[PDB]
């Protein structure tokens, strides 16, 4: 599943919904090919690990939404 016809020029938006240990939240958007935008989203989560703890992801909306939670 998650069937995808790749095109170098494809343009999509990946939405990352972040939830932190204290319940605070934020959403960040990443644009580019599906693959590159997805990589950038996870890269952002990694930059936040030092201050917010390890993260866990639950993928939604056929891959266009990444619900990421930080353990603190
Ligand atoms: Zn699957
Ligand atoms: Zn094609
Ligand atoms: Zn198809
Ligand atoms: Zn693609
Ligand atoms: Zn490509
Ligand atoms: Zn710090």
In the reported structure, the alpha carbon of residue 1 is separated from the centroid of ligand 1 by a whole-number distance in angstroms of 6
53 contacts 47 by C-beta, under 8 angstroms: no
Distance from the alpha carbon of residue 13 to the mean position of ligand 3, in angstroms = 19
CATH number for the domain harbouring residue 23: 3.10.20.10
Nearest ligand (C-alpha, residue 48): 6
- Resolution, in Å, please? 1.8
| Binding site as annotated, residues for Zn(2+) | 10-11, 29, 35, 58
Range of the domain at 37: 1-72
Q: How many structural domains does the chain have?
A: 1
Which 3 state secondary structure label does DSSP give 51?
helix
Which among 33, 27, 57 has a CA at the least distance from the CA of 71? 57
Reference 20, options 67, 60, 66, 69; nearest CA is 69
Helix/strand/coil for 56: strand
- Report the separation in Å between the CA atom of 53 and the middle of ligand 3, taken as the mean of its atom positions: 38
Sheet of 65-70, strand order:
25-32, 12-19, 65-70, 55-60
């Amino acid at each position: 599943m998650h069937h995808h016809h790749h095109h170098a020029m494809e343009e999509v938006t990946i939405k990352a919904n972040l939830i932190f240990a204290n319940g605070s939240t934020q959403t960040a958007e990443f644009k580019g090919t599906f693959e590159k935008a997805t990589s950038e989203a996870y890269a952002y989560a990694d930059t936040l690990k030092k201050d917010n703890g390890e993260w866990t992801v639950d993928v939604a909306d056929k891959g266009y939404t990444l619900n990421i939670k930080f353990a603190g």
